[PDB]
């Protein structure tokens, strides 16, 4: 019953869904398997100008997992956005 995530995805635009595919690639640019690891995601935050603890991302990916494989997919990425805007737990 995550309407917030259902509507958030719909409210999106052709540009958003299109750009969502670019970011995923930029994140897994070096990844061989093709998955964004907690370390990979954080590596981008470091060059951005911040320094988010590795305990946050790790716990985040797990909290935003569909099957709990420990990897964020194009789908889990779309929900990760709203999950933060409506983070309660």
């Amino acid at each position: 019953m995550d309407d917030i995530y259902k509507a958030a995805v719909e409210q999106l635009t052709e540009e958003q869904k299109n750009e969502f595919k670019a970011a995923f690639d930029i994140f897994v640019l070096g990844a061989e398997d093709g998955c964004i690891s907690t370390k990979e995601l954080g590596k981008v935050m470091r060059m951005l100008g911040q320094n988010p603890t590795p305990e946050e991302l790790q716990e985040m990916i797990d909290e935003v997992d569909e099957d709990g494989s420990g990897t964020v997919d194009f789908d889990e990425w779309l929900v990760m956005m709203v999950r933060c805007m409506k983070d309660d737990s």
């Binding site: 670019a22 981008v44 805007m85």
Partner: peptide, 20 residues
């Protein structure tokens, strides 16, 4: 009634998407 999170940041990595 709120504003989207700071996601545009990563959008600027590629070059500058939705920078404004």
């Amino acid at each position: 009634r709120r504003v989207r999170i700071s996601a545009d940041a990563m959008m600027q990595a590629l070059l500058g998407a939705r920078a404004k």
